[PDB]
Design a protein around this ligand. Structure first.
Ligand SMILES: Cc1ncc(C)n2nc(/C=C/c3nc(-c4cn[nH]c4)nn3C)nc12
Ligand SMILES: [Mg+2]
Ligand SMILES: [Zn+2]
Ligand SMILES: [Zn+2]
Length: 312
């Protein structure tokens, strides 16, 4: 059969957590398929269906600065790295569902937060009162799966099909950062009282939730120049939302106010300390081989400290 292969540098580097998928948009589908093939098997999906699914997903990401098709592939690569470093811990359905979930997790994102849609009173905020964008992302995923010739899961049974869509749904909902805090606290407690048990479905669910937050936040786990340049795209969305808040007559939070550009280094610090570090710590406790994410995150915190001290 037809095995996708990548040039030597990418073949080697794609296995590392800190891999950057590069600026050549046209290689991103092949990179993703390569990942599916190695973490799942060349047999997981009908190549033609998979190819068709990928291109529809791509077409349904928008040309926004950060929440775009490059982000989808990036988050899916992080998941690939997690799965490859924890070979025996995941079921066949999970390996299948999770890369698709990551590719799909921000489908049709407009560059605006849940909180902005609520204040704008967007129709989606009446449809989905919490995790507004995320329930939309999963809705878009099902739509795409139901297009003619796009059903990459067609060869599973009815109940395996329902299980995989259930994995994907929960994984996608989990990318709502509002839900991460309590999820990580539960996980922390279960781990430390020794009650964490991966045969309990509701525990796996939590752990897969955490992996989703880890993959989603993985720009903070890259080489410093990648992390720093990604931060620009992130803030370009934040500030556009800030402007839109001002248009509705609402002072945005500082994160989103382009007049407070100076406080960015200090805002990154708060974020690494309140969100990122806790996230990769708990993940490393649960899944030891994901430690390089924690180590990379801490290096980047240290880089933001240097920026504040004027050394950078
Ligand atoms: C790197 C990153 N990846 C994902 C996500 C959701 N985030 N969120 C942040 C936010 C940082 C931040 N910046 C300011 C601020 C700026 N100027 N003044 C204050 N506050 N905060 C909280 N940063 C990230
Ligand atoms: Mg999202
Ligand atoms: Zn996001
Ligand atoms: Zn995302």
């Amino acid at each position: 059969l037809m095995q996708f292969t990548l040039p030597v540098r990418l073949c080697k580097e794609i296995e590392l957590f800190h891999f950057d998928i590069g600026p050549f948009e046209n290689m991103w589908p092949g990179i993703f398929v390569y990942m599916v093939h190695r973490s799942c098997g060349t047999s997981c999906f009908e190549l033609e269906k998979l190819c068709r699914f990928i291109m529809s997903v791509k077409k349904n990401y928008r040309r926004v600065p950060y929440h775009n098709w490059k982000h989808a592939v990036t988050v899916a690569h992080c998941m690939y790295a997690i799965l490859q470093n924890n070979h025996t811990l995941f079921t066949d359905l999970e390996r299948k569902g999770l890369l698709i979930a990551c590719l799909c997790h921000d489908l049709d994102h407009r560059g605006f937060s849940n909180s902005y849609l609520q204040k704008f009173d967007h129709p989606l905020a009446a449809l989905y009162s919490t995790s507004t964008m995320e329930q939309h992302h999963f809705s878009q995923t099902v739509s795409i799966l139901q297009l003619e010739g796009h059903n990459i899961f067609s060869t599973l049974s009815s109940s395996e099909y329902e299980q995989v869509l259930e994995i994907i749904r929960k994984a996608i909902i989990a990318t709502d950062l509002a839900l991460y805090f309590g999820n990580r606290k539960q996980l922390e407690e279960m781990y430390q009282t020794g009650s964490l048990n991966l045969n309990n479905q509701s525990h796996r669910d939590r752990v897969i939730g955490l992996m989703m937050t880890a993959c989603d936040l993985c720009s903070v786990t890259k080489l410093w120049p990648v992390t720093k340049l990604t931060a620009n795209d992130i803030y370009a969305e934040f500030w556009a939302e800030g402007d839109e808040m001002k248009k509705l007559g609402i002072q945005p939070i500082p994160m989103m106010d382009r007049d407070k550009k100076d406080e960015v280094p200090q805002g990154q610090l708060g974020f690494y300390n309140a969100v990122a570090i806790p996230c990769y710590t708990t993940l490393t406790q649960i899944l030891p081989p994901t430690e390089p994410l924690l180590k990379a995150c801490r290096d980047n915190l240290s880089q933001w400290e240097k920026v504040i001290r004027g050394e950078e």
